[PDB]
Amino acid sequence: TGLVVFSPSLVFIAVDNLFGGDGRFPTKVEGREFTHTEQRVINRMLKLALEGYSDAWKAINPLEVEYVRSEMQVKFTNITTSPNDIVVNTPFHVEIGNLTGEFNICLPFSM
Amino acid sequence: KDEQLQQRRANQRLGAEVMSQRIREMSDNDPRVVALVIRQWMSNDHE
Amino acid sequence: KDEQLQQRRANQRLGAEVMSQRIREMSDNDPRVVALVIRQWMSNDHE
Amino acid sequence: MSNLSGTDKSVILLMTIGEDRAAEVFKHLSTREVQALSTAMANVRQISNKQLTDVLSEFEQEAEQFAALNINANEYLRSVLVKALGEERASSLLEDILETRDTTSGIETLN
Amino acid sequence: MSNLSGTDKSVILLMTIGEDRAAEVFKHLSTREVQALSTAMANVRQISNKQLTDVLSEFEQEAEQFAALNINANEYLRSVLVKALGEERASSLLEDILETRDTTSGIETLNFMEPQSAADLIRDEHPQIIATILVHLKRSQAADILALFDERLRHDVMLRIATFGGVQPAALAELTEVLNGLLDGQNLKRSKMGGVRTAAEIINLMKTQQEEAVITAVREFDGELAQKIIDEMFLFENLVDVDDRSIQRLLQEVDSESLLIALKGAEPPLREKFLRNMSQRAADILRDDLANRGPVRLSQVENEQKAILLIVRRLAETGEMVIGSGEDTYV
Amino acid sequence: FMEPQSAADLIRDEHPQIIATILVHLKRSQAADILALFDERLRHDVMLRIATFGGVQPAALAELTEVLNGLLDGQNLKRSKMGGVRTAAEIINLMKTQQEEAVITAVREFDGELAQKIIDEMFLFENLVDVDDRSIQRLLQEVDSESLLIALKGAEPPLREKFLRNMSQRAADILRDDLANRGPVRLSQVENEQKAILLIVRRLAETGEMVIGSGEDTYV
């Protein structure tokens, strides 16, 4: 299994833009769980990301990507057999106007 | 036909108003009686 | 024939205007009645 | 003859009689029936003139056939008992009379 | 007979009646039907004279056949209930009646439900989500909820309210369905039955020592609560049953201006009770002052009434006058 | 029909001639708003291209139109305008005085003009008729005659009568004659005088000489 990491700043910016906020306000990330509406927004851009990733990969190897579930803590996931297992991470820095966020793609080297 | 229908409606509403004055009269005479009559109505709603 | 048709149209429009004055009258008397009549119309649009 | 429920017809009668008369009719009604009729006149639909006339005619028939007595149904009780057995035994019998009418919930038993 | 849809026919009627009449008819219509008829009066086509005549004739028939009652359908509730059970029970039954018509979305449940639990629900939500939910509700509910959030979050939320730019339709639909699922719990209806004006009524009943200990404890716990309870203890109605000698004694302590202001809100029976006891000159001048002076604010009237209630309490503590619930029967 | 900001985001990458072509077709306000969002260089280039437009080919414009249709094929944009200003202020009008004063202080710190607009929406030139007679008598002692005359021109007849009936007969008569005699005055000037007297009302309510309460003073 692979992992998609959506950062709190990115989710905050996405929800702010989606729900009427123009994003001009300073981003206030204090640390809190994602609500059900925030979960739906997460689901939407995650679906877009998975479709885009499948499209990107299809040029080399066609594969099927399926959403499993979402978690808030790294202990919830335990993507590898052991924490010392070598894994691949790919970061992406997304900028919209003046608001910056990050999102990552984590695939085990065994994959 | 329109005049006949409108005068029929006028007669109906006048009679309704007259007996509504009557209903007002008996209601102010014996409000317990009308309360018990609507008690009968609420009771017979169920069959 | 043209004069007959035009006078028939004139009579129809005059009657429509007369009862439209009537409808204006009832609407300014009891606007709740006409509102709930068009409520009836909206309700029966679906059958 | 539309399917005019008797509760809605009683609502119509309460509408036609008038304000003080409606309150007087209410004062001789039980709480559950009061709530039922209040909800009925909350969701009341406006009635046609002909259905109005039918309801008022049948109600006049019922009132004429059912109007009698109900002179002093409660105070006649007390006056007869007082003039008969004196105040203390009249009060004892009246308390037995009023307690014969059971509660529906144990809360009123507590009272 | 062309296929004239009834919505378009209703548009025809609305066009023909006139602007004021059209608005009056609208005012008795629900929002969804208003938007449906709005789309109809948007895409309205021209109607021929004969179809116009047929529509108006059938509409006149419907209006004539179904026109009746609709006199006071809403205010009949309030008038009957007020004259029947008094204002408080009238309002309770009226609130139940107006809540009997359910919401369609959980947003209006949030409006109808308790502000404190609403703040608990919305505190963790996104501040923009908080703004979106808050704008939807009735303004009193939103103000109450904002009164419960801490300073910082309330600051961010109001600023988002002011700088609101517009929620996406899919976003608001998902938010609404989430709220509907969350509030799908059957009924909230926190039964308001009981509380103040019952506490004081009960304290009015038991032994003097017990009630004085109770009110002392209530004062220790919350002085304002005790003062409210005591104001409900006395009530400005037993002044007519606290009999004549108390009236004569309290005249010796009440200022003329305070009495004049208080008697304006007093009932005619209480005014006559106070007037008939003292001298003819004093009664006449007091009655003339009551009939001559202009209206005085309820706040001032209750201030004077509270001052004289303090005077009554102070004299009853001295024991010059008797405040008894049991009516003094005279033989 | 859609938001100028998102339009600018969409068209910023496009060719400057393409930008000019798209801007030509739209409503003038939309084009001006979009141009207000582009940086100076691209805006200047697009304006110069608008001025020096020579004519797009029919196949070119058809392909551009079909591309735009495909891009905007996303079902509905319709960014709901529901809520915002005139909602925030009438929110702030309700809660506790301390809470709402903290409110206006924080709003002013974030943006002064936003706070000023919010406060102007707080007061509204309508509660001067429910702020009762004594406030009218007090505010006459502070309002200039010319400012009052200009403000009352836009005031409603009920508010004008409310202000007039309280003071002396001579003052009321001369004010009414001035209102009926002076010609029309610009709405900007009327609102300027109204804002000045609203500042006076706020400064007197801060001193506590007058009571501004939403609850109507019931009289018995």
Curated annotation (Swiss-Prot), chain A:
Effect annotated for changing residue 43 to E: Altered motor bias with clockwise rotation, partially suppresses a yhjH disruption
Compartments where found: Cell inner membrane; Bacterial flagellum basal body
Disulfide bonds listed in the record: none
Highest taxon in the source lineage: Bacteria
Protein's job: FliM is one of three proteins (FliG, FliN, FliM) that forms the rotor-mounted switch complex (C ring), located at the base of the basal body. This complex interacts with the CheY and CheZ chemotaxis proteins, in addition to contacting components of the motor that determine the direction of flagellar rotation.
Similarity field: Belongs to the FliM family.
The protein, known as: Flagellar motor switch protein FliM
Encoding gene per record: fliM
Curated annotation (Swiss-Prot), chains B, C:
Cellular localisation: Cell inner membrane; Bacterial flagellum basal body
Induction: Inhibited in nutrient-poor medium.
Superkingdom, natural source: Bacteria
Disulfide topology: none
Signal peptide segment: none
Described function: The M ring may be actively involved in energy transduction.
Assembly with partners or alone: The basal body constitutes a major portion of the flagellar organelle and consists of four rings (L,P,S, and M) mounted on a central rod. The M ring is integral to the inner membrane of the cell and may be connected to the flagellar rod via the S ring. The S (supramembrane ring) lies just distal to the M ring. The L and P rings lie in the outer membrane and the periplasmic space, respectively.
Family under the similarity heading: Belongs to the FliF family.
Protein name as annotated: Flagellar M-ring protein
Source organism phylogeny: Bacteria, Pseudomonadati, Pseudomonadota, Gammaproteobacteria, Enterobacterales
Gene: fliF
Full-sequence portion shown in this chain: 514 to 560 of 560
UniProtKB/Swiss-Prot annotation, chain F:
GO molecular function: cytoskeletal motor activity
Entry's Gene Ontology cellular component terms: bacterial-type flagellum basal body; plasma membrane
UniProt keyword Repressor, yes or no: no
TM stretches of this protein: none
Keywords assigned by UniProt, alphabetized: Bacterial flagellum, Cell inner membrane, Cell membrane, Chemotaxis, Flagellar rotation, Membrane
GO biological-process terms attached to the record: bacterial-type flagellum-dependent cell motility; chemotaxis
Superkingdom: Bacteria
Compartment list: Cell inner membrane; Bacterial flagellum basal body
Membrane-topology descriptor: Peripheral membrane protein
Location, primary (coarse class): membrane
Residues carrying the site annotation Part of the EHPQR-motif: 49
Family: Belongs to the FliG family.
Described purpose of this protein according to its UniProt entry: FliG is one of three proteins (FliG, FliN, FliM) that forms the rotor-mounted switch complex (C ring), located at the base of the basal body. This complex interacts with the CheY and CheZ chemotaxis proteins, in addition to contacting components of the motor that determine the direction of flagellar rotation.
Protein name as it appears in the record: Flagellar motor switch protein FliG
Native organism: Salmonella typhimurium (strain LT2 / SGSC1412 / ATCC 700720)
Lineage: Bacteria, Pseudomonadati, Pseudomonadota, Gammaproteobacteria, Enterobacterales
Gene: fliG
